[PDB]
Design an enzyme around this catalytic site. Structure first.
Site, short mmCIF file in Angstrom:
data_model
loop_
_atom_site.label_atom_id
_atom_site.label_comp_id
_atom_site.label_asym_id
_atom_site.label_seq_id
_atom_site.Cartn_x
_atom_site.Cartn_y
_atom_site.Cartn_z
N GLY A 1 0.64 -1.13 -0.03
CA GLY A 1 0.00 0.09 -0.16
C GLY A 1 0.66 1.20 -0.04
O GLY A 1 1.86 1.18 0.04
N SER B 1 2.18 7.84 3.83
CA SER B 1 3.57 8.36 4.57
C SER B 1 4.45 8.66 3.65
O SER B 1 5.64 8.47 3.70
CB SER B 1 3.89 7.40 5.76
OG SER B 1 2.88 7.12 6.66
N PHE B 2 4.31 9.39 2.78
CA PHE B 2 4.90 10.14 1.71
C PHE B 2 5.67 8.97 0.73
O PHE B 2 6.57 9.14 -0.21
CB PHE B 2 6.16 10.82 2.08
CG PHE B 2 6.96 11.65 1.18
CD1 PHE B 2 6.07 12.48 0.12
CD2 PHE B 2 8.28 11.97 1.28
CE1 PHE B 2 6.51 13.21 -0.65
CE2 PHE B 2 8.82 12.77 0.25
CZ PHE B 2 7.96 13.26 -0.53
N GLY B 3 5.36 7.72 1.02
CA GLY B 3 5.73 6.58 0.09
C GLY B 3 5.00 5.32 -0.09
O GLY B 3 3.64 5.63 0.25
N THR B 4 5.35 4.34 -0.68
CA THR B 4 4.78 3.05 -0.90
C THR B 4 5.53 1.90 -0.42
O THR B 4 6.75 1.73 -0.72
CB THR B 4 4.50 3.09 -2.39
OG1 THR B 4 3.76 4.08 -2.95
CG2 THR B 4 3.79 1.68 -2.66
N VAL B 5 4.74 1.07 0.61
CA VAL B 5 5.61 -0.03 0.91
C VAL B 5 5.29 -1.32 -0.06
O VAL B 5 4.25 -1.62 -0.71
CB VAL B 5 5.03 -0.46 2.36
CG1 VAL B 5 5.65 -1.60 2.90
CG2 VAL B 5 5.21 1.04 3.30
N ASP C 1 2.54 10.31 15.08
CA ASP C 1 1.49 9.69 14.22
C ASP C 1 1.12 8.30 14.66
O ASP C 1 0.89 7.53 13.68
CB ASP C 1 1.82 9.78 12.59
CG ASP C 1 0.44 9.75 11.78
OD1 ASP C 1 -0.64 9.82 12.38
OD2 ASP C 1 0.76 9.23 10.78
C1 6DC Z 1 11.71 1.64 11.53
C2 6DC Z 1 10.44 2.58 11.13
C3 6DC Z 1 10.84 3.11 9.95
S1 6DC Z 1 9.39 4.11 8.79
O1 6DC Z 1 9.20 5.20 10.02
O2 6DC Z 1 9.87 4.65 7.67
N1 6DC Z 1 8.15 3.18 8.68
C4 6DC Z 1 8.24 2.04 7.89
C5 6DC Z 1 9.44 1.85 6.97
C6 6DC Z 1 9.04 0.61 5.99
C7 6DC Z 1 8.19 0.01 5.87
C8 6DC Z 1 7.00 0.24 6.70
N2 6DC Z 1 5.91 -0.16 6.91
C9 6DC Z 1 5.77 -1.79 6.98
C10 6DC Z 1 6.96 -2.54 7.46
C11 6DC Z 1 6.70 -3.72 7.63
C12 6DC Z 1 5.41 -4.66 7.11
N3 6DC Z 1 5.62 -5.96 7.49
C13 6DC Z 1 4.15 -6.54 6.81
N4 6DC Z 1 3.17 -5.81 6.79
C14 6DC Z 1 1.90 -6.50 6.10
C15 6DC Z 1 3.15 -4.47 6.40
O3 6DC Z 1 2.29 -3.84 6.08
C16 6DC Z 1 4.39 -4.04 6.87
C17 6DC Z 1 4.30 -2.53 6.67
C18 6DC Z 1 7.17 1.30 7.69
C19 6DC Z 1 5.99 1.66 8.59
N5 6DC Z 1 5.10 1.88 9.14
#
Ligand code: 6DC
Length: 250
Positions: free
Chosen positions: A17, A20-24, A129
């Site tokens: 998804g 937060s300024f980006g896409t994971v 947040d």
């Molecule tokens: C250590 C925090 C770094 S960040 O402030 O840049 N946040 C993230 C940086 C990279 C990935 C992130 N998200 C994330 C990170 C890991 C995740 N693992 C499994 N699933 C289903 C996810 O949706 C999932 C989402 C996040 C978040 N929140």
């Protein structure tokens, strides 16, 4: 620079998804990783500095309840790399799955969240947040708090009114997470008008309806929620007192 991951080492997979300024994305790098791509390309050095500052913050964190920062990339694109969390977000568990969490597990999730926030505040990091969408339940059992590099239902009255971000506004957001845990619902679900909620919470005429807290929820937990949700920021407890009250409540 010891944490920069060279171009080509990460195999980017399924898009999860954006926000937060980006896409994971899910990715592969010595196992599973999450890769948050920033919406930039040829970063201007002003952007490249803000990026290095953000990485500097994340590098300060080593705690079991903080999403594990693992590295960053500049090529082919700016990105933050973290562990992958096996499972889903707390938001999905509470508001989509409708998992039957025992009250025991609910309080444990609350306890682990407070530990992570206490840790962040000890490292002089204001989250700004905190919300159940960016709290992950790794292997269903370990809280991981993410999204503190760099919506309204978790915002304290002083933040809505628009620097209002503080330890105490973090505490309020945690109180809303507590409300989610103990009711299974988001606050103000009866209202469902975003401008109304902004107007009302901002002026201090509206707060979550604690009568929706589940009946088997302990009264000490209900009172702790009410303290974190105090409209006056200076009346909110700190996370060490929250952590004490929780771990001594169980
Ligand atoms: C250590 C925090 C770094 S960040 O402030 O840049 N946040 C993230 C940086 C990279 C990935 C992130 N998200 C994330 C990170 C890991 C995740 N693992 C499994 N699933 C289903 C996810 O949706 C999932 C989402 C996040 C978040 N929140």
């Amino acid at each position: 620079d010891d944490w920069e991951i060279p171009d080509g080492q990460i195999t980017v997979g399924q898009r999860i998804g954006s926000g937060s300024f980006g896409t994971v994305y899910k990715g592969k790098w010595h196992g599973d990783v999450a890769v948050k791509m920033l919406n930039v390309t040829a970063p201007t050095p002003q952007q490249l500095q803000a990026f290095k500052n953000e990485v500097g913050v994340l590098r300060k964190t080593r705690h079991v309840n903080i999403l594990l920062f693992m590295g960053y990339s500049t090529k082919p694109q700016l990105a933050i790399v973290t562990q992958w969390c096996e499972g889903s977000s707390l938001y999905h568990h509470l508001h989509a799955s409708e998992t039957k969490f025992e009250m025991k597990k609910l309080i444990d999730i609350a306890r682990q969240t407070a530990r992570g926030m206490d840790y962040l505040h000890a490292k002089s990091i204001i989250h700004r947040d905190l919300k159940s969408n960016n709290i992950f339940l790794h292997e269903d059992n370990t809280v991981k708090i993410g999204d503190f590099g760099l919506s309204i239902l978790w915002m304290a009255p002083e933040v809505i009114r628009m620097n209002p971000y503080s330890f105490q506004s973090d505490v309020y957001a945690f109180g809303i997470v507590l409300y989610e845990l103990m009711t299974g619902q988001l606050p103000y679900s009866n209202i469902n008008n975003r401008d109304q909620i902004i107007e009302m919470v901002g002026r201090g005429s509206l707060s979550p309806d604690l009568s929706k807290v589940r009946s088997n929820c302990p009264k000490r937990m209900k009172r702790l929620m009410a303290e974190c949700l105090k409209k006056k920021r200076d009346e909110r407890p700190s996370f060490p007192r929250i952590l004490a009250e929780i771990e001594e409540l169980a």
